[PDB]
Amino acid sequence: LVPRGSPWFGMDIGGTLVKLSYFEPIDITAEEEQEEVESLKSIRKYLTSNRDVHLELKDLTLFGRRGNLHFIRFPTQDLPTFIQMGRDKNFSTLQTVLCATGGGAYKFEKDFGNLHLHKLDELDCLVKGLLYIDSVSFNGQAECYYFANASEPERCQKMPFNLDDPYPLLVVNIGSGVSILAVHSKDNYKRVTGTSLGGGTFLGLCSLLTGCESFEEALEMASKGDSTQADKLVRDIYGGDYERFGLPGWAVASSFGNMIYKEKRESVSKEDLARATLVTITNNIGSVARMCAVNEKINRVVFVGNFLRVNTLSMKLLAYALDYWSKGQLKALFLEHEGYFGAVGALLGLP
Amino acid sequence: LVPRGSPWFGMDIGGTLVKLSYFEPIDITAEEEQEEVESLKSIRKYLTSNIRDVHLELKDLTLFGRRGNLHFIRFPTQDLPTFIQMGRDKNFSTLQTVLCATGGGAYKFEKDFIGNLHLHKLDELDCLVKGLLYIDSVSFNGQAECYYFANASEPERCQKMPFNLDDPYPLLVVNIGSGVSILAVHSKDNYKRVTGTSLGGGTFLGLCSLLTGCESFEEALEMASKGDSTQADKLVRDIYGGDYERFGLPGWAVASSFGNMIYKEKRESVSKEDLARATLVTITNNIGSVARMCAVNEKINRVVFVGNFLRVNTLSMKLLAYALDYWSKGQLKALFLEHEGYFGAVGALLGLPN
Numbered sequence: 155l156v157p158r159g160s161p162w163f164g165m166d167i168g169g170t171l172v173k174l175s176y177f178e179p180i181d182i183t184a185e186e187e188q189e190e191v192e193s194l195k196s197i198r199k200y201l202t203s204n205r206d207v208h209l210e211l212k213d214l215t216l217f218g219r220r221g222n223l224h225f226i227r228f229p230t231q232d233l234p235t236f237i238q239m240g241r242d243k244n245f246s247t248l249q250t251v252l253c254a255t256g257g258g259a260y261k262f263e264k265d266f267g268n269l270h271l272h273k274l275d276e277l278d279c280l281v282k283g284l285l286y287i288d289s290v291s292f293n294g295q296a297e298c299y300y301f302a303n304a305s306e307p308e309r310c311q312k313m314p315f316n317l318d319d320p321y322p323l324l325v326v327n328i329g330s331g332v333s334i335l336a337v338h339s340k341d342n343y344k345r346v347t348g349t350s351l352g353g354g355t356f357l358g359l360c361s362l363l364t365g366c367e368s369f370e371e372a373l374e375m376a377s378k379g380d381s382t383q384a385d386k387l388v389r390d391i392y393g394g395d396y397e398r399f400g401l402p403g404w405a406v407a408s409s410f411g412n413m414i415y416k417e418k419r420e421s422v423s424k425e426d427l428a429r430a431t432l433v434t435i436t437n438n439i440g441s442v443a444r445m446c447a448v449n450e451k452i453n454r455v456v457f458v459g460n461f462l463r464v465n466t467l468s469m470k471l472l473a474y475a476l477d478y479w480s481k482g483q484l485k486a487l488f489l490e491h492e493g494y495f496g497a498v499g500a501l502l503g504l505p
Numbered sequence: 506l507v508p509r510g511s512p513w514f515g516m517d518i519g520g521t522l523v524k525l526s527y528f529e530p531i532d533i534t535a536e537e538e539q540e541e542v543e544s545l546k547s548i549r550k551y552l553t554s555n556i557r558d559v560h561l562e563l564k565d566l567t568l569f570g571r572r573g574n575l576h577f578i579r580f581p582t583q584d585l586p587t588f589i590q591m592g593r594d595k596n597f598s599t600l601q602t603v604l605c606a607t608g609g610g611a612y613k614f615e616k617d618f619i620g621n622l623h624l625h626k627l628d629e630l631d632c633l634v635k636g637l638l639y640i641d642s643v644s645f646n647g648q649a650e651c652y653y654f655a656n657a658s659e660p661e662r663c664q665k666m667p668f669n670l671d672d673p674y675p676l677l678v679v680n681i682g683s684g685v686s687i688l689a690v691h692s693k694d695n696y697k698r699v700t701g702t703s704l705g706g707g708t709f710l711g712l713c714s715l716l717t718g719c720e721s722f723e724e725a726l727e728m729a730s731k732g733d734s735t736q737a738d739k740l741v742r743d744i745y746g747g748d749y750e751r752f753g754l755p756g757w758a759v760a761s762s763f764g765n766m767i768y769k770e771k772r773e774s775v776s777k778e779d780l781a782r783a784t785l786v787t788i789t790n791n792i793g794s795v796a797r798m799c800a801v802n803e804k805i806n807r808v809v810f811v812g813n814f815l816r817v818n819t820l821s822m823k824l825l826a827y828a829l830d831y832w833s834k835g836q837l838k839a840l841f842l843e844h845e846g847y848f849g850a851v852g853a854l855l856g857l858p859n
């Protein structure tokens with residue numbers, strides 16, 4: 155079960171960006187393969203012309219062969235150039251069909267000449283790519299990490315986590331919405347639940363509330379804001395902690411709850427509203443993930459998805475939230491190769 | 506244990522209104538008690554001067570061994586000192602020494618109790634629980650105190666039906682005020698707050714006020730009732746063109762709350778009513794999921810929803826019914842109680858000094 159063509163690559167075609175993973179063999183005996191390798195290098199330098207280099211996995215064994223696994227991203231605008239480069243450099247894999255995942259794949263097959271697309275499922279690719287990368291480690295170092303002292307986001311530090319045996323695992327996938335997968339083995343996983351309150355809710359609400367024009371700007375606003383200007387805290391109701399039920403005064407009682415008062419709405423800043431939106435969304439995800447972890451009886455919770463790809467702020471709030479709801483019993487886990495699991499899953503589905 | 510005082514009443518003192526329950530005994534042998542019953546009627550008529558509550562009156566129930574009627578009234582906090590003075594002038598022994606009340610406004614009221622009454626503050630959630638469990642135990646004049654919505658998956662068509670909740674335990678109580686507390690009730694004297702969510706009624710009103718400029722909870726609900734959430738939300742069909750077959754999601758399910766609002770074109774055409782509806786759907790869908798997950802983790806299959814989020818339009822109740830039905834795949838029915846609003850006051854009555 156080794157792919158038919160060469161070179162071996164996997165692609166995840168987004169609306170804006172393609173994530174591509176490709177394998178560079180290192181035991182080369184033929185003139186043709188040596189020029190394939192050189193062509194891949196030249197193609198890579200061109201497509202990434204305007205971090206991923208540092209993701210390269212060196213000397214791994216894939217389908218019985220030694221090589222380096224590379225990870226690149228480029229605009230979907232230039233995917234025709236990638237395909238043509240492949241045809242001109244006589245790549246057997248860019249002739250017969252194209253096997254890709256991602257939200258832009260079907261669209262791309264319509265935009266694009268002669269090409270037949272074999273479309274792969276993003277969640278199936280995600281799980282396969284995630285398990286494989288975890289199985290090979292990150293050049294002998296930790297693929298997985300968490301934030302120590304998660305209850306203090308201004309002070310938490312990144313620490314390696316051993317996920318050498320990944321099973322069972324809960325995967326919390328945060329895109330526009332949130333899907334939660336329980337993974338029991340390579341061949342046994344399902345979407346156990348989800349929430350429609352995801353990164354699209356964060357960005358949607360920020361756009362409406364603040365007039366921001368991108369995920370990047372919304373997160374920058376949030377990074378500068380104070381959510382407690384919008385949120386009603388337990389101390390706002392009780393004058394301190396809610397003793398009887400042991401809710402601390404600093405817990406959020408009602409997200410956006412102070413915005414019911416005309417005077418509070420008049421003085422709240424755009425940045426406070428952006429932060430309150432983010433905090434509402436990340437605290438809520440940490441609650442759903444914790445309850446799923448309890449019900450599924452799984453104590454390893456990994457977070458992936460495009461929501462995490464810009465600021466480390468999203469991740470730190472998720473770490474804080476999971477620690478809060480679990481009373482310190484669960485650590486939010488994150489993965490270095492996040493963003494490339496679909497591409498890697500697509501590569502592994504080549505055969 | 507029976508309360509020491511006569512007459513028996515309980516109050517929940519809010520920031521603007523007081524909710525009072527009082528017991529009118531049926532079997533009177535002493536003239537002073539007859540005069541007490543006549544006083545309460547006159548007091549009730551005064552305070553409610555200037556019909557839903559009358560219809561709530563529970564007739565011929567048994568409280569602390571005595572047959573009687575339990576009355577429910579609401580009146581401005583502005584007139585609470587009058588009520589206290591009325592009781593003191595009519596010689597009520599329950600207004601002689603100490604007044605035990607619940608409600609966020611009880612402490613503000615403290616100085617008026619000009620006078621020699623100590624305020625003993627009771628906890629609102631403890632009162633809610635004691636009140637709720639007692640009212641379920643007696644019924645609504647035979648009629649059902651508890652109801653659900655049949656065909657909950659179709660909020661346009663769902664029908665309010667009686668639900669027999671005779672043996673309450675165990676019960677999950679989802680209390681929706683500004684935020685959400687969830688209590689697992691195992692028996693009358695063993696319950697705990699098992700979790701909560703900060704996305705409650707205050708989130709709905711707060712976001713609505715920001716998004717649409719509505720001025721009140723009543724107005725936000727009115728707007729939401731006319732709106733279409735699917736104008737703001739991104740559905741599974743918007744992502745896949747239809748169902749997402751492989752992972753058990755129908756095309757009509759919400760993929761991303763407010764998710765279409767990332768598009769300028771969509772933001773410019775969405776109505777205030779649609780934004781109000783999407784806010785409400787987002788909150789009710791999320792509470793449904795939390796409630797369902799709690800039910801399964803606590804192994805409880807009766808989930809009751811209470812709190813001020815429910816008191817203004819039937820819409821929020823039907824949407825919660827809808828959400829719980831969705832997440833439980835029809836295995837849980839959302840339950841509601843007719844005397845919601847007064848459980849605090851009833852729990853305070855039950856907490857009279859004995």
Ligand SMILES: CC(=O)SCCNC(=O)CCNC(=O)[C@H](O)C(C)(C)COP(=O)(O)OP(=O)(O)OC[C@H]1O[C@@H](n2cnc3c(N)ncnc32)[C@H](O)[C@@H]1OP(=O)(O)O
Pocket residue numbers: 166167168169255256257258274275276327328329330331332333334347348349350352459460493496741744745749754757758759760761790828831
């Ligand atoms: C009654 C009620 O409705 S309560 C609400 C119940 N609803 C739910 O439980 C649904 C919650 N939501 C979800 O599970 C998710 O939103 C899903 C699964 C429906 C969609 O997944 P999302 O992560 O939101 O998709 P989003 O459009 O942000 O895209 C994220 C990734 O998927 C890929 N993708 C998007 N669409 C497709 C597609 N049609 N085919 C293949 N891949 C796709 C993207 O390219 C992107 O990939 P990347 O992370 O590798 O860059």
Ligand SMILES: CC(=O)SCCNC(=O)CCNC(=O)[C@H](O)C(C)(C)COP(=O)(O)OP(=O)(O)OC[C@H]1O[C@@H](n2cnc3c(N)ncnc32)[C@H](O)[C@@H]1OP(=O)(O)O
Pocket residue numbers: 388391392396401404405406407408437475478517518519520524607608609610627628629680681682683684685686700701702703705812813846849
């Ligand atoms: C990291 C994170 O923070 S994740 C977030 C975690 N947060 C949580 O779990 C908390 C979520 N929130 C909650 O549980 C609730 O909001 C609480 C319990 C804190 C407050 O309860 P709410 O229902 O929101 O209070 P709200 O002010 O809306 O009042 C509701 C009722 O309680 C009563 N009440 C309010 N304050 C008080 C008070 N101080 N004393 C007595 N009664 C009170 C009101 O009078 C009102 O009475 P009614 O039901 O008869 O009308």
